[PDB]
A paper describes a structure:
Coronaviruses from the four genera all contain envelope-anchored spike proteins that mediate viral entry into host cells. During viral entry, the spikes bind to host receptors through their S1 subunits and then fuse viral and host membranes through their S2 subunits. S1 contains two domains, N-terminal domain (S1-NTD) and C-terminal domain (S1-CTD), either or both of which can function as the receptor-binding domain. Coronavirus spikes exist in two distinct conformations: the pre-fusion structures are present on mature virions and have a clove-like shape with three S1 heads sitting on top of a trimeric S2 stalk; the post-fusion structures are the membrane-fusion state and have a dumbbell-like shape with three S2 subunits forming a six-helix bundle structure.
We constructed the IBV spike ectodomain (from IBV strain M41) in the pre-fusion state by replacing its transmembrane anchor and intracellular domain with a C-terminal GCN4 trimerization tag, followed by a His6 tag. We collected cryo-EM data on IBV spike ectodomain, calculated a density map at 3.93Å resolution, built an atomic model of the structure and refined it. The final structural model contains all of the residues from 21 to 1022 (except residues 702–710) as well as glycans N-linked to 20 sites. The overall structure of IBV spike ectodomain resembles the pre-fusion structures of coronavirus spikes from the α-, β-, and δ-genera. IBV S1-NTD takes the same galectin fold as the S1-NTDs from the other three coronavirus genera, but it contains unique structural features. Above the core structure are some loops that form a partial ceiling-like structure. The structure of IBV S1-CTD is significantly different from the structures of S1-CTDs from the other genera. Its core structure is a β-sandwich containing two β-sheet layers: one is five-stranded and antiparallel, and the other is two-stranded and parallel. Moreover, the additional structural motifs on the edge of the core structure are also diverse among different genera. In the IBV S1-CTD, two extended loops on the edge of the core structure function as putative receptor-binding motifs (RBMs) by potentially binding to an unknown receptor (see below). IBV S1 takes a cross-subunit quaternary packing mode where the S1-NTD and S1-CTD from different subunits pack together. As a result, the putative RBMs of IBV S1-CTD are partially concealed, disallowing their full access to the host receptor.
Numbering used by the authors:
A (entry chain A): 21 to 701, 711 to 1022
B (entry chain B): 596 to 701, 711 to 931
C (entry chain C): 452 to 499
D (entry chain C): 836 to 883
The structure:
């Protein structure tokens, strides 16, 4: 915090916890200046000498050292004083030579921060060299006249006096730095209660995000903002009168006169000893009746009756809008003036001022008119809400100027009809002189939230219609991607070198001036930040997105004879996905979360009975409903036991799958790929002993009453689940004799697409080379462009962001006076504090309601993905069904599951070949036999269309080019053929002897 | 018929311009409400990113091969009048007849000047209060080729385009899989033609009066409109306060007594934005559910003809044809 | 906490949220120490 | 249903004897708080 752009300044000796927090104080810099080696011919600066000043008349000063270098010993540091107009402040490590009465020549001694007037000394305090290890900085601040040896306070007094000089003695060391400063707002991230860095509100593009959204280390995505700045041509449109007017406001005056007698018994017998009225235009009301006239606050009988007129009498002169107005003063009684003279009287509402009056006043009320009361003057006001007359103080400056010249299409200030805004104004009267766009009462149209959408103006050849829309920066955005700021996505064109979809784009200069314009590059998939056919990298430059797709084929559908394309060779294209399957159960302890560790707050809480039952029952229900069918999910899919490690030194044939399964040398039972998944992201003793940076938030949670519960499947019972599942996928089948742990399963699962089982010595190394290329693309794919990794990222960030906002909802006070509850009862009254405490407790229980509802919605999400998970485990892993492109964009071969952060990660293996052959095809036969008969042969279902090669005839499967002689069980005999055949004269059944 | 929702309009709440009006004040009072705008922004940013990634996953898993061919239904088929069901040559938009009948039951502007319509021109009333939209990662006029390419892969997939077989041979070679043969000729050829012609006659009768897709379209469009049109009319609704607009609270009464009123009003409006963000997240869960059912039914009922009894269409199904819809 | 500069040159307590004390200091021995406050054994008991 | 006797920031739960205990133009704030709370409870019901 001792950089060349700001000086830190600790806010008064306490520290709020780990996180960003805002302050306001003298933090900036202006006129940085250096100085070094202010010593004479002596080998060390002598202690106690106050000389060596430097005249600076500024509103601050700061003497800063290099980063923790200047020790307190001899030949290194001396007095380093300011001075005010009369009083001084000087530090002195006065170790003994002969001079001061301290008598110590060592460390572990004290200091002397002491003020000094013209002749004498006072305020000796002696802070130790402990807690102040090394001289870092030294300020002197104008307001409150306080002085700051590095960080906290050492001395305040009464005055408000600016700095006049400063100066430091030292023999050698770092070159010291003098700097003066102004006062801005800033906020400082600090962990453990000591400042690391600050963010200033200096109008920088990095600063405005922190200064408006009260945070740093921001998430990725979009963020809107503002920067209000306008000194341009303002224009005012006043309310036009009939014709030929100079807008002159009338002045209605009042004065207490030599009034008459107080009233007799009747409430109609009180006479208004003034009368005024409002007709049109503008007015102001000179009330000189604040002179020794108290205001009487309304209560059950006496006082004012200002309900139905929310303004108070000394606030009429601001901009209001009435429809008819008439005020008058009247000297009646006080206890029943307004409460009777509003209902049965002649005014909408009335006020009741008072003074020192004689107590001979006959009051007005039914049945109580025989006493003697006070006589304070009561004013009347007959308000009718509307828009005909407007009350204002200053005279309107448009003096004989009919509205001919007001600006259009420029970002101006406007004050039209007493409602201040900031936007620009178009001309829309071409579409509005038709469609009777306003009725016979022509003034503005309010939209919602009290602004103006369309107003009128009068004075030209014909009346027009103007529309008000806000300026160019009403919604600017700037894109962040990953960890840092990239550029402002605005609506204006400040030579913006890039156009996105319906928005203009600029880019902030990072160091060098270049790298502003380039040719866009085509990206397959990007997870960074995506915005409408355009993708933004953390480098800063955009790159347009265009999705790829892979080929597929269903090709044999055969009419009249023509050659067809069926594959001979084949490849495997991997595809991943992630499905969530678990949830952390919570347990809200409402009594310890709402109130702190106090003796009180609990007796006030014990009439909030059933709301803790309501906040507890839904959490208990979702906990039980998750915990039962989680064990159902574990008992439906855990195959047979198979408690065998299978730790990937098992000799397979030619399939390098040891990349994908677990290793012998690891402290946790973990393979390589889910270790790569884990590096992108319940037994403790919370009393003593930390573990990590993120796992040790459990002690901050348990000390506020948000604790977790272990699942019904225990820890180290799920790390055997994945290994047992792949062990049942591999070993299931063979009797473990003949080097077949993983290969034979794959070859006997790949020939189900055609129609054979477990063929040898053909299609054995082709599968090996194809699967080796597939796992090569797989080990390339995870680190840069995959599908599972960003899903892992979004799920982990949402699961963390649910609970970390209902912990930071504690310092957020509700409608109240403070946040903590220990010092509400100490500042104010007893029976007035209970409303504050009730508001705060109701707010915190509302926050727990939000937590429980979010947890139930997330439970519905995870139960959905868990039943999809048990369906995909039951089908894609152990079955190999023929459902086309259920899992992995094609007719799938095999899957292998792996562990994840609270889920499972699949690896699907598709079947998409590309290399084809060109072979002639035919659709049927009709052989005629010898004596008398006729039939046809059509290829049956599930055995594929049949082809010919160089004279002979062969059937084949629809996916693998595998010629084979036609047998007797693949025929369909039909008594028809219609010249779309071959018609061999001899039989082609090829039966046997 | 049936209808499945698959898309969502992304929103972007601008809290500072929505809470206070175009005023010089109300902002210095607002700058101690720091983290609640971060909380109302983070969930909208998260649902926007989580929708926008796997929407492109859904587009890249099912867009078949390209096939950037119009196939505009003057292609001579045998006896199947399917030109009712596919796109027409003379139209300003690439639109067939049936989804035009679907559209008549229900992002490039210049908001400074120039209206468009009665309902689309609420976007200028939304953008002047800070509830703006963002374009999807599949751009406009990239989804109108999607349906045409999908039916082009359903038809042309197979044959090598020689012998008058654009749509017929696919259907006859898909209908004899219920029995056990493949692509039989001169028996079962006009019976299929008469049956399918009667089926499309009942189909063209069915949409206007008694169908199943149309009322689902109606309920989905009305709910998607009614989510946002109550958090615009929640501005004039004052909370525990004295008025609704904030320009004339400071002009009627005292300074240090107005701050309680302004705090109540701002807390109420941020509560309304919280209701908006929660409703948007629930609707995202709904549309992600129907989108994964959508990619399952595109992968099975369109290009595969599996033997699952009455998965799609109350019986052992033969073929399906998808068409466009409101989102 | 004598390492990791666990409090700065202004040595007093660290408030956590809700106005309690997490780590405070004390002075008067050979060197200043650092004490931590955690609640008692029955801050969250449950009964089934 | 049991959210009826639960008063909000108010002086009582039933509304028949709010107007009988205190002033007219001071009761309307109490009644507005109570009605706003009950409509919030109906909002929770409809969302669930
Ligand atoms: C603002 O105006 C008020 C009304 O004009 C003034 O109040 C008046 O003060 C007079 C002097 O005390 C009173 O006259 C006396 O009234 C009593 C009846 O209570 C008679 O017995 C006395 O004989 C009579 N004194 C005479 C005639 O010399 C008025 O009655 C009284 N008016 C009232 C109460 O309505 C305020 O003094 C005045 N305030 C100012 C100027 O600051
Ligand atoms: C916003 O648009 C309005 C509509 O065009 C403008 O109002 C027009 O101003 C013109 C010039 O003042 C008027 O033209 C005059 O019309 C009279 C009678 O028709 C002729 O005798 C004059 O010769 C003619 N002036 C010329 C040709 O220079 C239009 O009649 C008038 N249109 C109306 C009132 O509907 C506004 O001026 C415009 N706003 C601004 C700020 O320019
Ligand atoms: C909390 O832990 C602290 C750290 O261990 C304890 O502080 C230690 O107290 C010891 C005894 O008071 C000190 O030992 C002395 O050290 C000096 C110089 O190092 C030696 O000259 C003394 O002989 C030696 N005393 C012996 C050996 O008896 C430690 O220096 C000191 N550690 C520090 C300050 O970091 C606290 O005592 C402990 N709290 C409680 C309540 O016990
Ligand atoms: C800054 O404060 C110092 C400390 O009082 C001032 O030094 C004194 O100056 C007066 C007259 O200038 C001398 O009579 C005193 O003897 C000085 N004090 C000591 C201890 O010697 C100094 O003048 C002040 N700076 C300015 C510019 O006024
Ligand atoms: C601060 O400490 C100094 C030590 O120098 C005190 O100065 C002494 O003041 C008294 C009364 O004025 C004199 O009789 C002594 O001779 C001074 N000591 C010296 C010169 O060594 C000063 O009083 C202290 N300030 C207080 C207690 O407020
Ligand atoms: C929060 O932001 C701060 C920036 O002030 C990060 O602190 C930096 O972290 C990197 C990581 O190695 C270090 O190299 C820098 O030296 C750190 N800077 C300072 C001033 O300490 C901090 O890591 C961020 N916290 C996160 C992202 O959790
Ligand atoms: C704040 O205190 C924590 C607690 O010690 C510090 O965290 C330690 O950081 C170091 C890094 O140098 C790790 O080696 C330790 O394992 C961490 N302790 C844990 C996890 O208990 C943190 O660095 C401190 N912040 C500072 C000094 O700025
Ligand atoms: C099934 O058994 C046969 C016969 O043993 C295995 O074929 C052997 O394969 C290896 C590896 O290519 C050759 O080195 C041997 O010469 C083959 N044996 C022969 C030809 O008799 C086949 O690998 C087995 N299938 C598996 C293990 O999946
Ligand atoms: C209110 O103003 C709008 C804006 O002009 C009018 O809407 C127009 O109506 C006509 C015929 O009804 C259409 O031809 C235009 O296209 C509409 N303009 C739009 C939608 O921007 C509306 O009719 C007016 N209401 C009335 C006159 O009652
Ligand atoms: C497959 O090819 C045959 C050609 O043998 C087509 O049969 C023709 O069908 C039309 C329409 O019924 C008749 O007019 C022709 O006379 C037939 N040709 C003959 C008998 O040689 C058959 O339509 C084709 N299948 C398709 C296009 O799906
Ligand atoms: C600004 O810095 C220069 C550096 O030489 C110095 O001379 C001057 O006095 C400074 N002005 C101030 C501190 O007002
Ligand atoms: C403050 O110091 C500056 C330094 O040059 C001087 O010009 C000015 O007159 C001083 N103001 C006073 C002594 O009031
Ligand atoms: C700081 O000093 C300025 C000097 O004008 C003053 O206006 C401001 O109130 C002071 N800030 C405080 C006392 O917090
Ligand atoms: C400020 O307080 C001191 C303390 O005694 C006093 O002497 C001085 O007169 C005060 N300043 C005023 C009242 O302006
Ligand atoms: C906001 O306005 C200030 C005032 O000129 C300007 O310096 C700053 O660059 C603006 N922020 C942007 C353009 O992001
Ligand atoms: C009284 O009214 C006249 C116009 O009738 C105006 O010029 C003058 O400023 C007013 N006096 C005030 C406002 O004190
Ligand atoms: C009200 O009238 C009095 C009568 O002298 C005058 O002194 C005062 O300035 C007026 N107040 C205004 C015009 O605000
Ligand atoms: C934005 O300004 C540039 C000038 O550098 C211009 O070339 C471009 O056409 C403008 N964009 C528009 C008008 O959409
Ligand atoms: C498909 O396999 C053939 C031979 O096995 C190979 O030459 C070709 O590169 C493969 N194509 C891929 C992996 O895309
Ligand atoms: C594979 O690793 C296990 C782990 O202990 C070991 O027992 C076995 O002998 C290894 N196989 C070898 C070395 O062939
Ligand atoms: C499998 O691949 C890994 C990756 O480096 C390699 O270390 C290992 O030797 C390979 N095993 C084989 C080829 O059997
Ligand atoms: C665990 O906490 C208990 C709590 O009393 C404590 O007695 C025990 O020493 C702790 N174990 C450690 C720190 O290893
Ligand atoms: C197969 O070969 C024939 C003749 O060589 C050719 O006409 C036909 O186009 C080929 N099929 C392909 C390339 O798919
Ligand atoms: C079908 O319409 C297209 C579109 O213009 C045209 O090119 C083609 O010739 C038409 N087919 C005919 C007229 O047979
Ligand atoms: C298909 O039906 C439409 C419906 O009217 C008709 O206009 C068209 O002529 C028909 N096409 C045929 C029979 O080829
Ligand atoms: C679009 O809006 C801009 C805003 O400055 C304006 O300059 C331009 O003329 C408008 N284009 C139209 C209305 O065609």
């Amino acid at each position: 915090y001792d950089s060349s752009s700001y000086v830190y300044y600790y806010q008064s000796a306490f520290r709020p916890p780990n996180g960003w927090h805002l302050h306001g104080g003298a933090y900036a810099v202006v006129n940085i200046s250096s100085e070094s080696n202010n010593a004479g011919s002596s080998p060390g600066c002598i202690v106690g000498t106050i000389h060596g000043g430097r005249v600076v008349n500024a509103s601050s000063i700061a003497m800063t050292a290099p980063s923790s270098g200047m020790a307190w010993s001899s030949s290194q540091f001396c007095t380093a004083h300011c001075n005010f107009s009369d009083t001084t402040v000087f530090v002195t490590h006065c170790y003994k030579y002969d001079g001061c009465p301290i008598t110590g020549m060592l460390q572990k001694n004290f200091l002397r921060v002491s003020a000094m007037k013209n002749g004498q000394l006072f305020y000796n305090l002696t802070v130790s060299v402990a807690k102040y290890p090394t001289f870092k900085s030294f300020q002197c601040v104008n307001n409150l006249t306080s002085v700051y040896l590095n960080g906290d306070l050492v001395y305040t007094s009464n005055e408000t006096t600016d700095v006049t000089s400063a100066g430091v003695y030292f023999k050698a060391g770092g070159p010291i730095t003098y700097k003066v400063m102004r006062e801005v707002k800033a906020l400082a991230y600090f962990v453990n209660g000591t400042a690391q860095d600050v963010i200033l509100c200096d109008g920088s593009p990095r600063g405005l995000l922190a200064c408006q959204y009260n945070t740093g280390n921001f998430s990725d995505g979009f963020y809107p903002f503002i920067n209000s700045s306008l000194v341009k041509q303002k224009f005012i449109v006043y309310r036009e009168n009939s014709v030929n007017t100079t807008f002159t406001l009338h002045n209605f005056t009042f004065h207490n006169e030599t009034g008459a007698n107080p009233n007799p018994s009747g409430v109609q017998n009180i006479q208004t000893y003034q009368t005024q009225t409002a007709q049109s235009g503008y007015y102001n009301f000179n009330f000189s009746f604040l002179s020794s006239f108290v205001y009487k606050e309304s209560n059950f009988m006496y006082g004012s009756y200002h309900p139905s007129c929310n303004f108070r009498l000394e606030t009429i002169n601001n901009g209001l809008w009435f429809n008819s107005l008439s005020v008058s003063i009247a000297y009646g009684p006080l206890q029943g003036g307004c409460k009777q003279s509003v209902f049965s009287g002649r005014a909408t509402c009335c006020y009741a001022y008072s003074y020192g009056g004689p107590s001979l006043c006959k009051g007005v009320y039914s049945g109580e008119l025989d006493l003697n009361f006070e006589c304070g003057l009561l004013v009347y006001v007959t308000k009718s809400g509307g828009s005909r007359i407007q009350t204002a103080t200053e005279p309107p400056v448009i003096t004989r100027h009919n509205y001919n010249n007001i600006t259009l299409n420029t970002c101006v200030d406007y004050n039209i009809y007493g409602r201040t805004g900031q936007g620009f104004i178009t001309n829309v009267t071409d579409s509005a002189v038709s469609y009777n766009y306003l009725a016979d009462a022509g003034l503005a149209i309010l939209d919602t939230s009290g602004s103006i959408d369309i107003f009128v103006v009068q004075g030209e050849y014909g009346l027009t219609y103007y529309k008000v829309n806000p300026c160019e920066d009403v919604n600017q955005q700037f894109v962040v991607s990953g960890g840092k700021l990239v550029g402002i996505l605005t609506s204006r064109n400040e030579t913006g070198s890039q156009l996105l979809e319906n928005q203009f784009y600029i880019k902030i200069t990072n160091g060098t001036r270049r790298f502003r314009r380039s040719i866009t590059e085509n990206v397959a998939n990007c997870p960074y930040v995506s915005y409408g056919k355009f993708c933004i990298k953390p480098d800063g430059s955009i790159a347009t997105i265009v999705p790829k797709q892979l080929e597929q084929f269903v090709a044999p559908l055969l009419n009249v004879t023509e050659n067809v394309l069926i594959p001979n060779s084949f490849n495997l294209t991997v595809t991943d996905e992630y499905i969530q399957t678990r949830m952390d159960k919570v347990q809200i302890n409402c009594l310890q979360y709402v109130c702190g560790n106090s003796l009180d707050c609990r007796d006030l809480f014990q009439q909030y009975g059933p709301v803790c039952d309501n906040i507890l029952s839904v959490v208990n229900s979702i906990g039980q409903k998750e915990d039962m069918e989680l064990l159902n999910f574990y008992s439906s899919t855990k195959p047979a036991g198979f408690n065998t490690p299978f730790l990937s030194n098992v000799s397979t044939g030619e399939f390098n799958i040891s990349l994908l399964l677990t290793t012998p040398s690891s402290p946790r039972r973990r393979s390589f790929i889910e270790d790569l998944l884990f590096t992108s992201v319940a037994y403790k003793n919370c009393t003593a002993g930390p573990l990590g940076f993120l796992k040790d938030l459990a002690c901050a949670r348990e000390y506020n009453g948000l604790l977790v519960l272990p699942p019904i499947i225990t820890a180290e019972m799920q790390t055997l689940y994945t290994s047992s599942l792949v062990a049942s996928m591999a070993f299931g089948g063979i009797t473990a004799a003949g080097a077949i742990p993983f290969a034979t399963q794959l070859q006997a699962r790949i020939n189900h697409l055609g129609i054979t089982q477990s063929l040898l010595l053909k299609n054995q190394e082709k599968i090996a080379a194809s699967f080796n290329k597939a796992i090569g693309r797989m080990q390339e794919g995870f680190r840069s462009t995959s599908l599972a990794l960003q899903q892992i990222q979004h799920v982990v960030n949402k699961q963390n962001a649910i609970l970390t906002e209902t912990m930071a909802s504690l310092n957020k006070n509700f409608g109240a006076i403070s946040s903590l509850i220990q010092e509400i009862y100490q500042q104010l009254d007893a029976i007035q504090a209970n409303a504050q405490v009730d508001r705060l407790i109701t707010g915190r229980l509302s926050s727990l309601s939000v937590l429980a509802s979010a947890k139930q919605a997330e439970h519905i999400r995870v139960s959905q993905q868990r039943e999809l998970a048990t369906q995909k485990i039951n089908e894609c892993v152990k079955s190999q069904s023929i459902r086309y492109s259920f899992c992995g964009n094609g007719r799938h071969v095999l899957t292998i599951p792996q562990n994840a952060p609270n889920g499972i990660v699949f690896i699907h293996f598709s079947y998409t070949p590309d290399s084809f052959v060109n072979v002639t095809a035919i659709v049927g036969f009709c052989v005629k036999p010898a004596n008398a008969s006729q039939y046809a042969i059509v290829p049956a279902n599930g055995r594929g269309i049949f082809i010919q090669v160089n004279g002979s005839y062969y059937i084949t499967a629809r996916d693998m080019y595998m010629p084979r002689a036609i047998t007797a069980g693949d025929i369909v005999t039909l008594t028809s053929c219609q010249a779309n055949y071959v018609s061999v004269n001899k039989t082609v059944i090829t039966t046997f002897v």
